[PDB]
Ligand binder design. Structure first.
Ligand code: SF4
Ligand SMILES: [Mn+2]
Lengths: 343, 218, 98, 342, 98, 342, 343, 190
DNA sequence: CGTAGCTGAGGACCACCAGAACTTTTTTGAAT
DNA sequence: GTTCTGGTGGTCCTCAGCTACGTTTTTT
């Protein structure tokens, strides 16, 4: 369907894939929908319960193309590949850089600058939209502080110091996080961070959302051969996806916090879906969880543009290609990893 | 360690460390898990008892199950099986109801009482966690064992608390070191579920040098 | 390991949910072993898989209305089974080439 | 300590694989060839245009069931690889050791020790129980040559020079391997190496045996949790299952070659088994394929005792257990990785 | 050795000799044993009685149309047999005080 | 070498028995109560009012399945006896042996030898386990006397004399038997081995044991193809199937009395289960009888060895083999019938 | 039904024997059919696939009344008895007499006297009703020969002499029996006598009828308490019921041979239903055997009067009664055993 | 004039080739071309009866005439005896016995014999000579001597005794025993 | 009463047909 | 391409019911 950087994508379920001559062909119960070339492609990524054609796999593997089958929601199912496997030098270089400080700090500072870049224009955009009920001067002052820390972190090379500006920026964003609420302030309030046993309502939402993101971005690295358990800014620890968390930082704001804001402001969910715990903790409800997942699926289908390339893409494909870029950063002619500088 | 809450260890690792030092290493370093008859039956018991979102009260008391509880002194988080709240004007008022109630933690296991501490350790540590949430002190603990279908009482003493603190610090050090120890074999590992992994048969025997040199020479 | 185990079941479809119970039991028991005659299955399992299957079934059927029996023939199952009719069963330890 | 589950080999073309519950079902245009329980399988080897629905691939990947595709004569058409587990420390340590030359050189020392010992043991067993029909004196002379070379190779510290000695030892061993024509006529005589084309007999069987051994070594190395694409031996050519070949090296001396030789002397196959098209190299038949697979699976159930472990286990469990002995050494448990000295 | 054996039949009722063969096999096996489930009989016999039953029962059934399986457990059958449902059986080592 | 088979005690009154194929079916006014195969059922014992179809009687009788009808509290009535299965030579030799005092006194000698030996050694063993509850010395003295009896029992040739000696064997043991009991001396009012056919408590159990043993022994003798209840050695005075009693004289002292004594000592039943009629007779309640029968059968199932060669057999085979040996005596195999001796 | 000797011979099938007071009642399916006292009865013998009241059998078992159950055809099934009554003395006396020889010779000569009397009277009758086409003066000469046989047997005293003088009359019987055949004489003949593989059809019919009568007499001997495998005339042999053959040699006249003669006459059978296979044996067909058994049953159902007792009865009871008198001889209630005699 | 009593069955000739006591256990104690079949055959000089299983009458010029048909036929005997060919000649005795019975029926001599092997499905050919017939005559007269005396013999148990179905009645162990005298003195001592 | 021969009347039981769908934390869990 | 759910239909399976009868030359 859509080709981008020598890779083929398929998004619509129930669409068979076959080979005709030297070209790939999309089918849908004996209906021909498209035909695309294969001469210059590198890999095929599918999200349908298709199965493809065995001749297609044989030919592509004989020509050093790796096919990757996933599900219609974004899990990882299988990787059919010949002897190349796709990534060998890529993974070995990733692990070699994972023990070196300067390049890891470069990638880190790219993460910080991109995400807080995006965050501060989000603050500016929400201030522009709603001047009546928002004390915009405080947000403006925080915006100038954010720009100052932008300029200051643009020339930093120490990991612990970067963690420090992460701490201060996160505290500031927390102190401004309270005020983008505009409706049902009676019980939906934000008063800090509780990753473990969630407390005070909305917190729980964020945590769950974050988890989903990790899985999604994990699959992204799985498509490119990058390891999803060895982080650069985060440290490697068993049972935790360090690199997935590292890459999730930019997508945290728009794709999680803006999502929960769009959920709450439209009265999609209320206090009836949140159950209480005797120690004060807050729990989730089966119908509430299913409605949350349905709204998440609805939001995943939105079609937006890509700032760095301009090609139209859906949200569900954004984390993948970006990780691809990171892969192309490890082995490629790209000078620096391009962050998701989105306005 | 985003906010120091990411460095939280499991309660379930304490029992594994206490029985087979490498078993805890296997479960919480290399992320391995193999199941036998006893652990399958125990898991079935746990999921049968894992039925949240309902409360039964008999006029005075109430029960709560599957509590996500954490303690910052040891920085250990986990989930408790059951705690019973009794009606008495001695404890601190708890959110969700009215009046003053006292807490008593009870957990369910499937097996005979063990000569060592093992199981009771968990409740000991469990007690600490609760005293960090409700701001109170607990000196009484409850157990039920299903193999004999029998209720066993345990007091709470400071020597046990100190031992738990010591092992918590030691296992934090082991986790930071990423070190798998070696422990005595004994008849322990015949229901040690991960037996085909931590290969205790190879520890007590001779090293690689002499065997290969002898077989190479003759 | 891998002892042979034979499972038989007779559920009551005259009850309120008899048809549902029979379908669920058939599908649950099929996941582990073969079928040789209606209402009987032969499977090759170890103690772990047998335990899992036993709990699954006893949670699946109800008492007071249905019956279920289980037999284990040990490690030498090859020289204890004899067949006469015309309903062969494909063994799972032969080279298994299709 | 495992069960050595069975294996499935599909030969009929245009066969389709579906998943129902936990059972694998073979179809051919809505006509079902059968269904099997998946709690008894380890590997599925498809032949020809074998289409597998994605759900089956994912289910077999998440439970460590290897699926391989071969077209007609056991080439490297494809494999199947799944997602990751929590074995971060193991892979980290493996990469760190691979980065350093010295530990890799000791590993190569041990591998070539396995080479020399297993080769000398097999050739001396061949010489011992056999009368003047075999060249006893030259075989013994090659035995002393290898026994001389083994001490020197035991203390090597470079990869290129060690590659030199292993190559020359392979040539020396082939110089005596060129003689095994005891109970077979001259049409099955070994006449050098042919990498791509199975031009003559025997070598056509050799290619299939090599593929069948490699596709099991790769499965075992995926089972242990290790990553098998950064080799401790050979030049690290990107895009190859490096450690698969790395580990199957020591197995190559007894696992497939001895089986083929025993088959040839036992005359289990006949010259009519292989047919030839206009050039076609040398091709095997459906009967030949069936006989080879049946004999392979029958031999895989043989029972031996492991020398180092001193325990009784099925012979087909050499490649897993052997690979397992590597993983513990990656945690510093032993001082070096033990070879195979059967 | 007076061991336990289990016999399961399955006879087609559709053919020309369906009903008669079914009735005759059921009545010719109920003599030697007991009904624990439909089409599943179990009995306690020695070698000679079982051989006679096999030779007598291989002629009532018709091959290429029916199936018949015989499973022998052993003299220690008390440990390899389980009943979980609600159709209880009667053993033949009970003193049998009716 | 034979295999012991079950029995079948029908306790429900107003019942009925029937044949169907090779199965016995228990009927009660046209609602069945059970069906049992007839190839593992070595006897049938009826209680109260029971019937049987003539086909069942014929089939059982000609296939060695003894029927027996009892009333209410184990009163014997109407055994079922079938045909004569041949073996004329053994029967003729047995009948010839009778009416002659020499051989009759020889066999009586062996029989009484067995009885006295069993009584002596049972008493000696009892005082050997627990001496604190009993007076050892008296027991010892009795043994001495019994030993002397042996010689006299062997040194006699007139049936009248041995019978007289029987009385002495009664008078030396009966008085002792009172102190056999160790518990419930007040609950189980016991007046010695004194017996009353109307029963006086702690005689109902003893009578029941005697009846069951008599039925079993009669069946065992009629299975082998001869008759020894009105035979050669015992008295001819009619109405007394008591040579069977004379063949079980070596058993009634051990097999029945020892069983009753163990039952008393182990507190297996209590005086709550007994009661007394207005006329002075005593009866056992139904639960007591069921418990007694269960104990009897469970005791029968246990396995022991034999004095001859050590071959294993259960309790229930002790009577039958004792029958068989007798026939083997009359075919010239053994010099004289070797009795049962512990 | 009740014979004068104290035994019941209930022969109507499908009859229930119940106890009323101290009396036996015969019920034919819920109707009170018959009543009889029990004051002096010695034994009860019941025919037919039937039953007995449990109370009745329990009551009778006390007062030395053995109840014998035989099926309606004549096979002997069971004997319900308490302690055995009136059997041990009979058996021991039988064995003692068998060991002896003089009393056995007396019994054998009595049997032979009965046989020759039956034969002579049958010959006299036959020459009486049909003195038309037959050798008549030869039959009178045979009658006088049978009278001298009378005299020699009644004053005979040796076993070998008794056997020889028995054999002497057998051949005269053989020729006169061949002369007996009047109707259908053309195709059926008695040119010879064959026992082993009976040649000629008449020999096979003789063997068949002899087998039936032997089985019936064996049941008769067993139902009273006497062993059948030890004999008085014939000697000991395993598997052979010698006393049964003695009663055969007595009764093989009126009841056995007349049946075959009447079957041959009256055109009740043709040679088509008879076979001939390579040696002279006649393999009876199914229909012929069915008709033979039907005729045997019908003749068993015939009504006659016993010559000695004078009481009306059937033919089927004739064997049993005879055996009973033999028992009454050994128990001492009678001085002799007349099968068919004046005395 | 009763010649039937002195005649026995032919099968009893087999059991004096194996477990001599078994014959007394069964027969005394009483406890358990043309292809003609089931021939009742008796012989007077050796005084034995039985049933020949199969007789093949084959036409030839130099044969023996049969009763009822003119010409000359041979009467080769065929018996179905399963098992493996065995050294202890347990099956050739009944073949030679029935052959010589048939020959005594006609007073002539033949030297041919067929036998069936069911488990191997084999045809086996056997000639006969004087050394077999003399042994048969001696064995038959010795059998008559045993039968007329009602005597049960004693034989060595052997390894085969775990195969005779009468092992619960044959009682093999009562061959080499210490006798009741040792029991008497043992009970005297103890 | 027991042994066969046929009905008939409900239960068990497996293969199809059509239709609507297809997403979820992190924590406990054995040892004769 | 899979899971689950109703719903259908034709094949195994046993019990209740009514009619109609019951015997054979003596081989392991
Ligand atoms: S098994 Fe031995 S004792 Fe029994 S019949 Fe055969 S030879 Fe005789
Ligand atoms: Mn617990």
């Amino acid at each position: 369907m859509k080709k981008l950087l020598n890779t083929l994508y398929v998004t619509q379920p129930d669409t068979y894939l076959s080979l005709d001559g030297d070209n790939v062909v999309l089918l849908k119960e004996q209906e021909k929908l498209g035909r695309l070339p294969l001469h210059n492609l590198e890999a095929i990524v599918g999200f349908g319960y298709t199965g493809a054609s065995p001749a297609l796999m044989g030919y592509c593997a004989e020509r050093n193309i790796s096919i990757t089958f996933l599900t219609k929601n974004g899990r990882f199912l299988a990787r059919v590949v010949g002897e190349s496997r796709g990534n060998v030098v890529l993974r070995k270089t990733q692990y070699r850089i994972s023990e070196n400080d300067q390049e890891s700090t470069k990638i880190a500072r790219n993460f910080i600058t991109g995400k807080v870049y995006n965050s501060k224009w989000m603050l500016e955009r929400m201030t522009r939209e709603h001047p009546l009920r928002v004390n915009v001067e405080q947000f403006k002052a925080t915006s100038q502080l954010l720009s100052v820390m932008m300029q200051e972190i643009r020339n930093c090379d120490s990991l612990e110091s970067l963690r420090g500006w992460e701490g201060q920026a996160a505290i500031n964003y927390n102190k401004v996080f309270d005020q983008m609420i505009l409706q049902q302030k009676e019980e939906f309030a934000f008063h800090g961070r509780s990753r473990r046993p969630p407390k005070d309502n909305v917190n729980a939402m964020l945590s769950f959302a974050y988890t989903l993101l990790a899985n999604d971005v994990a699959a992204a690295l799985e498509t490119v051969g990058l390891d999803a358990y060895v982080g650069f800014m985060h440290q490697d620890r068993p049972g935790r996806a360090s690199l997935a968390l590292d890459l999730m930082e930019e997508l945290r704001g728009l794709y999680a916090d803006r999502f929960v804001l769009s959920l709450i402001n439209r009265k999609e969910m209320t206090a009836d879906g949140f159950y209480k715990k005797e120690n004060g903790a807050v729990l989730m409800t089966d119908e509430a969880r299913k409605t949350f997942l349905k709204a998440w699926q609805t939001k995943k289908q939105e079609k937006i543009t890509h700032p760095y390339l301009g090609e139209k893409m859906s949200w569900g494909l954004v984390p993948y290609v970006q990780a691809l870029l990171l892969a192309r950063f490890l082995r490629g002619d790209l000078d620096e990893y391009p962050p998701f500088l989105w306005k | 360690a985003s906010n120091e809450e990411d460095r939280y260890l499991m309660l379930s690792g304490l029992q594994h460390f206490q029985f087979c030092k490498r078993q805890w290493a296997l479960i919480h370093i290399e992320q391995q898990w193999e199941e036998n008859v006893r652990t399958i039956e125990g898991q079935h018991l746990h999921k049968k008892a894992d039925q949240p979102f309902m409360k039964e009260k008999r006029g005075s008391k109430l029960t709560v199950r599957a509590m996500p509880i954490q303690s910052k002194n040891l920085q250990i988080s986990g989930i408790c099986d059951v705690v019973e709240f009794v009606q008495d004007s001695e404890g601190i008022e708890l959110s969700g109801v009215s009046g003053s109630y006292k807490a008593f933690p009870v957990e369910y296991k499937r097996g005979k009482p063990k000569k060592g501490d093992e199981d009771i350790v968990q409740l000991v540590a469990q007690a600490m966690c609760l005293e960090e949430m409700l701001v109170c002190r607990i000196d009484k603990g409850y157990l039920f064992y299903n193999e004999i279908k029998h209720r066993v009482e345990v007091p709470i003493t400071d020597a046990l608390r100190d031992k738990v603190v010591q092992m918590a610090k030691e296992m934090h050090h082991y986790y930071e070191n990423r070190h798998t120890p070696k422990v005595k074999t004994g008849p322990f590992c015949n229901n040690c579920s991960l037996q085909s992994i931590c290969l205790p048969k190879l520890m007590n025997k001779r090293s690689v040098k002499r065997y290969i040199e002898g077989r190479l020479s003759e | 390991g891998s002892m042979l185990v034979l499972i038989t079941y007779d559920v009551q479809t005259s009850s309120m949910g008899g048809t549902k119970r029979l379908r669920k039991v058939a599908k649950a028991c099929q996941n582990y072993g073969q079928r040789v005659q209606n209402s009987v299955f032969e499977c090759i399992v170890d103690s772990t898989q047998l335990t899992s299957l036993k709990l699954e079934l006893t949670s699946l059927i109800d008492e007071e209305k249905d019956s279920l029996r289980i037999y284990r023939l040990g490690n030498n199952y090859k020289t204890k089974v004899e067949h006469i009719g015309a309903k062969p069963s494909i063994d799972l330890e032969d080279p298994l080439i299709f």
